Structure formats: structure tokens, C-alpha cells
Design an enzyme around this catalytic site. Structure first.
Site, PDB file in Angstrom:
ATOM      1  N   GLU A  11       0.808  -1.218   0.000  1.00  0.00           N
ATOM      2  CA  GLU A  11       0.000   0.000   0.000  1.00  0.00           C
ATOM      3  C   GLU A  11       0.828   1.247   0.000  1.00  0.00           C
ATOM      4  O   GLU A  11       0.324   2.309  -0.280  1.00  0.00           O
ATOM      5  CB  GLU A  11      -0.818   0.065   1.294  1.00  0.00           C
ATOM      6  CG  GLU A  11      -1.871  -1.043   1.324  1.00  0.00           C
ATOM      7  CD  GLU A  11      -2.973  -0.917   0.284  1.00  0.00           C
ATOM      8  OE1 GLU A  11      -3.774  -1.782   0.120  1.00  0.00           O
ATOM      9  OE2 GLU A  11      -3.051   0.190  -0.387  1.00  0.00           O
ATOM     10  N   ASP A  20      -6.622   6.833  -4.656  1.00  0.00           N
ATOM     11  CA  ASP A  20      -6.074   5.519  -4.823  1.00  0.00           C
ATOM     12  C   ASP A  20      -6.154   5.049  -6.289  1.00  0.00           C
ATOM     13  O   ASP A  20      -6.571   5.801  -7.174  1.00  0.00           O
ATOM     14  CB  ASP A  20      -6.667   4.540  -3.820  1.00  0.00           C
ATOM     15  CG  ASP A  20      -8.064   4.106  -4.154  1.00  0.00           C
ATOM     16  OD1 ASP A  20      -8.633   3.280  -3.500  1.00  0.00           O
ATOM     17  OD2 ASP A  20      -8.626   4.669  -5.179  1.00  0.00           O
TER      18      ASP A  20
END
Ligand SMILES: [Cl-]
Ligand SMILES: [Cl-]
Length: 162
Positions: A11, A20
Site C-alpha cells: 500500500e 487511490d
């Protein structure tokens, strides 16, 4: 290697709000703030999460704290899920981390389309499951990360991450 290190690799870490892969406002280590298009809305969810007026930026410590909560939540979510728990309980520790990563990324909800793969994992048919896992939007959208998780499920080791 463990779940935390593994997700931290997958991540990344960002201290300012960002979008994202799906273009949703996130911060920290993969902490989704909201699916809404409003940056305002996103800053509001962030202040609510941190408990302070952040102005869209957090410290490292605060990001790790969110991360710990999020990992914990995912695990509990799995244990509370009728379809997931049995799978998880059948797996060895490394593979369990692989299942956590997926849930963390996708939410229990999206976990439903993986029914067939889950069954194969429970049956310990590693290569079959690896092949079935790859036929998915998940694999087509974030192929590198997906490959790492799938390898993890296929071999039961952390080689993809080392
Ligand atoms: Cl929160
Ligand atoms: Cl990726």
C-alpha cells in the site's frame, strides 16, 4: 515478514490525502477515507478519524495508528464472516496473511465474487486456486500486487515479497 510488513509494501505510505488506484481519497497506508468525489467530504472524514483538525495532512504515527486499526478490523471482519472464517481457519499462517491482504484491499463485500477460489483454497488445491484467482477484475486492475498475493497463496512462503 508478517501482515503488517506485507501490506506496508503493497500500500505504501502517504501523509497527505491522495487518490487511490480506483481514484478514491485515501491517506496513510491504504486507509480509504471515502468513495465520494468531494475533497471536502474527504477532509471531513479524515478529521473525524484522527480526532483533530488536520487540514489533509497527518503524521507518521497517526498513519500507523490507523493502519493498526484497519488491520485489526479486517481480521475481525473475517472471523465474523460465515463465508470467510472457515477458509481462514483452514489455512496456515502465511496463507492467512494473504487472505487478510485481499480483504483489506477489497472489503468483505467484494469477497463474495471469490467464492470458487475460496473453496479451492479450502481444499488446498493451490495451483488451481491461483489460476482461478487471476481471472478477476482484481487481477486485471492491479496485476503486480495481485501476482504477489496469488504467489503467496500458491507457495505458502513469502518469496514474492522477499
Ligand atoms: Cl476510522
Ligand atoms: Cl499492482
Amino acid at each position: 515478514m508478517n501482515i503488517f510488513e506485507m501490506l506496508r509494501i503493497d500500500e505504501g505510505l502517504r501523509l497527505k490525502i491522495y487518490k487511490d488506484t480506483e481514484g478514491y481519497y485515501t491517506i496513510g497506508i491504504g486507509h480509504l477515507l471515502t468513495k465520494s468525489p468531494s475533497l471536502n467530504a474527504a477532509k471531513s472524514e479524515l478529521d473525524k478519524a484522527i480526532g483533530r483538525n488536520t487540514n489533509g495532512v497527518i503524521t507518521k504515527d497517526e498513519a500507523e495508528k490507523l493502519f493498526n486499526q484497519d488491520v485489526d478490523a479486517a481480521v475481525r471482519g473475517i472471523l465474523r464472516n460465515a463465508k470467510l472464517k472457515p477458509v481462514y481457519d483452514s489455512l496456515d499462517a502465511v496463507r492467512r496473511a494473504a487472505l487478510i491482504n485481499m480483504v483489506f484491499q477489497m472489503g468483505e463485500t467484494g469477497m463474495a465474487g471469490f467464492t470458487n477460489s475460496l473453496r479451492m483454497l479450502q481444499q488446498k488445491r493451490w495451483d488451481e486456486a491461483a489460476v482461478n484467482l487471476a481471472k478477476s477484475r482484481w487481477y486485471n486492475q492491479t496485476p503486480n500486487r495481485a501476482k504477489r498475493v496469488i504467489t503467496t497463496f500458491r507457495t505458502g512462503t513469502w518469496d514474492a515479497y522477499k
